[PDB]
């Protein structure tokens, strides 16, 4: 439909805390850190344990509690298709996205999935998804993003252009890729 | 029982350890005393129902910046811990830990606890203190941070004589246990 106002999607809405990130320190320079201090070094087990970049994004999930079947995104290798694949959800539907991802080698400091909305080239929406910080490993992490509700339509009812991407506290690109969803009714 | 992880913030020497210590084995520590607690999880009873509560407690050092938040993930509360006799790290809270724990865990009560409520009357404290241009924390000061940083609940304690040591876990607790209504954010449009 007509959007001409759609260029205005409110103020920012937004109440971001002034947060300092982490100076750049690897996990060598951790553990060697107060190595005599015993507690320390529980402390820092009971939170690390014992041709690839430091995170790789396997795949988003749409957990929909309505319709059967999961809802994917292969996040590994081709991601060009995106730009043609076309994905519906129906009308204000409850739903949340599942993130899963894996870390190797270094900390991810504050990780996070930030996802840009467009509709004809006019950003109507600015999300971010804080995911956390996380050690190293091989068993691969998942997480939920809090519940919520996909808008209403008997106006935002058109199809969308979506851009989105991962990054972090260090401001690094693990990810990031364009595709195109539509707001159906059934 | 239901589990609910809490993480124990705030500068270093306020008293994070002696208080998880102070409360799991009913003693104050005196001399011997850990930087870092060992995580453990008590089985406490509250409002008639048993909660396996999984108490965290952090090295507050800015030399572990980037290594601490790792324990925030999948937390349900947490608390940023201050000394009632020590401005600075009051201070120190609006500066360094509400920004770090909010940003790392948006939405997830947060409860402040001024620690050390045993020093806000000791002569010698309001002396050393006293001769620095400094006083001690006042109750309505940090009743008013805690509005500021949107706290669920304000509470002062001390480790050394246990009092209201019980309620800052009680209150921990029910902020996880049936809070407010959230406003289901993020509603798009
Ligand atoms: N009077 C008094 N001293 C305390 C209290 N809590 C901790 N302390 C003392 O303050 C110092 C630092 O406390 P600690 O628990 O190690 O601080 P942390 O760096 O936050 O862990 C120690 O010498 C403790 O005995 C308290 O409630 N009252
Ligand atoms: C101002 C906002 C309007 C007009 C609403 C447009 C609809 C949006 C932005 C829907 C959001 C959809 C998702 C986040 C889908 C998640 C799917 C995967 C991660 C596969
Ligand atoms: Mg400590």
Redesign the pocket.
Same mark, same amino acid.
């Given at each position: 439909e007509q959007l001409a106002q759609?260029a205005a @999607?409110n103020e920012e809405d937004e109440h971001s805390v002034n947060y300092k990130p982490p100076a750049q320190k690897s996990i060598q320079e951790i553990q060697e850190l107060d190595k005599d201090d015993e507690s320390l070094r529980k402390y820092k087990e009971a939170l690390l344990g014992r041709n690839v970049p430091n995170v790789v994004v396997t795949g988003? &999930? $749409?957990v929909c509690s309505s319709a059967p079947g999961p $809802? @994917? $995104?292969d996040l590994t290798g081709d991601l060009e298709s995106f730009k043609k694949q076309s994905?519906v959800?129906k009308e204000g539907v409850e739903?949340r996205?599942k993130?899963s991802f894996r870390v190797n080698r270094e900390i991810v400091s504050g990780m996070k999935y930030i996802?840009h &909305?467009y509709?004809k080239g006019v950003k %109507?929406?600015k &999300?971010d998804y804080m995911v956390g910080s996380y050690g190293p490993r091989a068993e691969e992490y998942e997480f939920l993003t809090p519940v @919520?509700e *996909?808008?209403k339509?008997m $106006? *935002?009812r058109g199809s969308?252009s %979506?851009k989105?991407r991962f990054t972090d506290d260090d401001k690094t690109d693990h990810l990031s890729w364009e595709?195109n969803?539509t707001?159906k009714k059934d | 029982p239901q589990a609910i992880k809490c993480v124990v913030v705030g500068d270093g020497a306020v008293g994070k350890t002696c208080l998880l210590i102070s409360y799991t084995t009913n003693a104050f520590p005196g001399e011997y005393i850990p930087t870092v607690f060992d995580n453990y999880s008590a089985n406490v009873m509250v409002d008639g129902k048993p909660v396996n509560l999984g108490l965290w407690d952090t090295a507050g050092q800015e030399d572990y910046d980037r290594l601490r938040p790792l324990s925030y993930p999948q937390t349900d509360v947490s608390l940023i811990c201050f000394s009632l006799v020590s401005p600075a790290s009051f201070e120190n809270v609006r500066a360094k830990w509400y920004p770090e724990v909010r940003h790392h865990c948006p939405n997830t009560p947060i409860i402040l606890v001024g620690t050390k409520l045993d020093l806000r009357d000791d002569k010698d404290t309001i002396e050393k203190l006293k001769e620095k241009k400094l006083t001690p924390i006042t109750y309505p000061q940090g009743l008013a941070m805690a509005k500021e940083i949107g706290a669920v609940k304000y509470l002062e304690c001390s480790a050394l004589t246990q009092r209201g040591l019980k309620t800052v876990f009680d209150e921990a607790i029910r902020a996880v246990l049936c809070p407010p209504p959230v406003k289901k954010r993020k509603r798009?449009?």
């Open positions: 759609i @999607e988003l &999930t $749409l $809802l @994917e $995104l994905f959800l739903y996205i993130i996802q &909305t509709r %109507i929406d &999300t @919520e *996909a808008p339509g $106006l *935002a969308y %979506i989105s595709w969803l707001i | 798009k449009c």
